[PDB]
Amino acid sequence: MKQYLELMQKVLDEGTQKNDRTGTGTLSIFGHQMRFNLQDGFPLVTTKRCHLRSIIHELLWFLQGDTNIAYLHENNVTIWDEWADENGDLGPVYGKQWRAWPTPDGRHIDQITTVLNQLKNDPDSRRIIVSAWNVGELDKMALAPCHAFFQFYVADGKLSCQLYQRSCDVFLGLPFNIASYALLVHMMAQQCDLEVGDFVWTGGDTHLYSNHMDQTHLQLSREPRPLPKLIIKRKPESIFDYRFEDFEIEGYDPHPGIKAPVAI
Amino acid sequence: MKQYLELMQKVLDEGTQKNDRTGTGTLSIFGHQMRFNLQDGFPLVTTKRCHLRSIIHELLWFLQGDTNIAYLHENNVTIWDEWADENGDLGPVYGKQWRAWPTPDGRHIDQITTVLNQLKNDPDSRRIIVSAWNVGELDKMALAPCHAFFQFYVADGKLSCQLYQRSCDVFLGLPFNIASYALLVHMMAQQCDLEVGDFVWTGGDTHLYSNHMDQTHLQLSREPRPLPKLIIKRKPESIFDYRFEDFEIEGYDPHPGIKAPVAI
Numbered sequence: 346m347k348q349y350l351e352l353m354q355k356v357l358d359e360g361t362q363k364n365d366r367t368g369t370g371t372l373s374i375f376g377h378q379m380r381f382n383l384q385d386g387f388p389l390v391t392t393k394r395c396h397l398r399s400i401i402h403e404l405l406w407f408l409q410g411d412t413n414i415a416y417l418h419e420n421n422v423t424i425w426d427e428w429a430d431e432n433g434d435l436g437p438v439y440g441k442q443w444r445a446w447p448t449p450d451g452r453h454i455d456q457i458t459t460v461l462n463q464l465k466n467d468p469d470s471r472r473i474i475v476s477a478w479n480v481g482e483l484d485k486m487a488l489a490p491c492h493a494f495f496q497f498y499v500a501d502g503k504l505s506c507q508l509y510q511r512s513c514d515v516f517l518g519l520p521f522n523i524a525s526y527a528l529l530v531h532m533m534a535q536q537c538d539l540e541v542g543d544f545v546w547t548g549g550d551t552h553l554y555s556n557h558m559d560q561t562h563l564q565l566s567r568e569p570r571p572l573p574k575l576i577i578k579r580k581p582e583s584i585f586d587y588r589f590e591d592f593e594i595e596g597y598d599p600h601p602g603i604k605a606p607v608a609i
Numbered sequence: 610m611k612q613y614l615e616l617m618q619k620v621l622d623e624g625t626q627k628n629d630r631t632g633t634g635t636l637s638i639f640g641h642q643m644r645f646n647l648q649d650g651f652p653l654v655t656t657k658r659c660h661l662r663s664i665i666h667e668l669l670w671f672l673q674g675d676t677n678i679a680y681l682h683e684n685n686v687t688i689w690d691e692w693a694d695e696n697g698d699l700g701p702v703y704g705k706q707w708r709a710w711p712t713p714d715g716r717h718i719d720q721i722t723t724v725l726n727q728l729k730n731d732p733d734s735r736r737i738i739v740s741a742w743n744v745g746e747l748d749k750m751a752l753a754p755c756h757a758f759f760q761f762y763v764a765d766g767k768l769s770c771q772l773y774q775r776s777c778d779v780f781l782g783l784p785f786n787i788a789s790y791a792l793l794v795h796m797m798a799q800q801c802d803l804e805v806g807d808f809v810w811t812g813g814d815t816h817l818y819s820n821h822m823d824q825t826h827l828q829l830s831r832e833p834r835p836l837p838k839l840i841i842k843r844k845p846e847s848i849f850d851y852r853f854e855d856f857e858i859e860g861y862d863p864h865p866g867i868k869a870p871v872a873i
């Protein structure tokens with residue numbers, strides 16, 4: 346994608362060498378924003394082949410309020426293996442926080458249901474937010490939330506969404522996160538009889554791992570192709586009733602995949 | 610300021626009319642980002658006279674972990690009166706979340722202190738965040754946090770900071786919010802013996818109220834003056850020991866003030 350490849354280059358030209366948590370070494374910038382008119386097509390990277398099943402199941406896994414990789418395994422998704430404990434648990438990560446944010450007094454808040462109701466009863470609201478950054482449970486998570494904060498917006502019958510990503514792996518994580526959220530907006534818009542608007546991506550520590558340099562240079566020399574089109578084949582009774590089989594992607598003709606190691 | 614005036618013009622150029630909570634009506638855009646290099650000067654608006662006294666006292670108040678307006682009152686600051694109750698309380702807003710975010714297990718987290726410790730011992734951490742968005746306590750707050758989430762970053766011996774403001778009153782709130790956070794970066798940098806870097810502002814629902822239109826065009830017809838300079842006359846033992854008198858603003862020659870009604 347145009348703006349993705351532009352960021353990829355910005356990191357190379359302006360990045361600062363940082364010794365990170367993993368001890369791998371990164372080239373990073375702080376503060377960046379991108380916008381994606383979803384009307385113009387689904388923002389699934391074409392300069393390299395991405396794989397929907399991993400993106401879709403993780404998202405459905407989230408909406409379920411699940412924090413154990415069991416579900417991801419029944420479905421052949423291995424992305425969260427290196428951080429799961431002996432029993433497959435990751436702690437109160439994304440899913441738990443989206444569906445059951447524990448109040449100080451023992452109650453639980455369902456941010457997704459809250460959001461749905463807001464989009465239906467008070468679309469002008471400036472408080473339609475979902476936060477995964479629960480400070481009280483940070484120490485109990487296998488890895489702190491990278492995509493930590495998102496806000497929805499409605500204007501002219503269109504649904505937009507802005508995500509705040511505190512930490513971003515430009516090569517590996519980014520393509521994933523962008524598609525994952527674009528997909529949620531489409532699911533949100535369908536359940537709220539609204540058209541899709543923009544997907545604004547805002548990042549904090551945006552970096553390129555030092556052992557991804559070759560793959561990056563390889564990716565930068567490929568011309569981006571027309572973005573595909575997402576087609577939702579059914580309208581479930583609720584946002585929680587979506588199955589993998591409901592999503593279809595037309596016209597995705599990407600350049601071959603590029604393999605790269607994950608920093609643990 | 611240049612960046613500020615460009616934002617105002619942007620809202621006017623591509624804003625959509627939206628009804629809001631206060632029943633005033635707004636002109637609004639979603640998602641925007643700007644940057645202020647603190648080395649260039651203190652980002653205090655010059656196209657209209659700002660009352661720095663209120664800005665400073667609010668911040669010291671925040672850092673004290675206070676949520677009652679008594680303090681602001683004994684220093685003649687009245688910016689929060691319209692939302693306080695009979696006893697002057699605002700509920701567990703900014704001050705409380707920053708210094709004592711209540712966990713589910715009975716603990717309380719001092720986000721400000723943990724950040725100071727992170728800047729000192731692990732400045733390369735991609736988790737130096739303070740969040741005022743406490744889902745479990747939103748219902749107890751007089752007004753939901755506007756400047757809701759912020760992240761620090763270190764590079765080349767300079768301290769930067771990015772703020773996510775979910776809702777922005779461009780005319781009234783923004784000039785204050787920009788100055789407040791810049792001041793904080795200066796305070797943090799001084800305690801960690803770091804130089805000031807960039808302040809990055811990011812907005813969700815960025816808007817201009819309908820009864821601010823005349824004032825907005827009046828301000829836009831002005832030429833920004835050169836930025837003021839911030840001088841701190843002392844280095845206190847802790848980030849919590851600063852006094853009003855420790856700050857000195859020099860070279861501030863703004864255009865005349867412009868009055869406008871606040872939407873409650």
Ligand SMILES: Nc1nc2[nH]cc(CCc3ccc(C(=O)N[C@@H](CCc4nn[nH]n4)C(=O)O)cc3)c2c(=O)[nH]1
Pocket residue numbers: 396399424425514517518519521603604605607608609
């Ligand atoms: N330092 C780092 N640690 C992380 N922990 C979790 C994430 C984001 C989720 C994620 C996990 C694994 C991959 C991955 O490892 N992706 C491979 C496997 C290929 C594949 N995935 N599914 N089928 N084939 C690839 O070549 O795209 C991609 C995203 C992540 C990251 O971003 N970077």
Ligand SMILES: Nc1nc2[nH]cc(CCc3ccc(C(=O)N[C@@H](CCc4nn[nH]n4)C(=O)O)cc3)c2c(=O)[nH]1
Pocket residue numbers: 660663687688689752778781782783785867868869871872873
């Ligand atoms: N819809 C709206 N509601 C809000 N509640 C809290 C805020 C931000 C804090 C704030 C409160 C009052 C003023 C204000 O009303 N500022 C006046 C008084 C002038 C003054 N302040 N102190 N001495 N003189 C002005 O002319 O700048 C500015 C910021 C705020 C906002 O932004 N907009």
Ligand SMILES: *c1cc(=O)[nH]c(=O)n1[C@H]1C[C@H](O)[C@@H](COP(=O)(O)O)O1
Pocket residue numbers: 366488489490491492512513514515517518519522735736
């Ligand atoms: C985290 C998870 C995700 O979905 N997206 C991402 O890009 N990441 C990346 C950021 C970073 O490379 C690593 C997390 O490390 P840290 O907690 O920021 O130190 O995964």
Ligand SMILES: *c1cc(=O)[nH]c(=O)n1[C@H]1C[C@H](O)[C@@H](COP(=O)(O)O)O1
Pocket residue numbers: 471472630752753754755756776777778779782783786
């Ligand atoms: C809130 C507080 C602040 O520090 N600065 C701001 O700009 N505001 C503004 C945003 C909005 O105009 C109003 C809060 O209302 P709502 O919660 O968005 O409905 O004050």
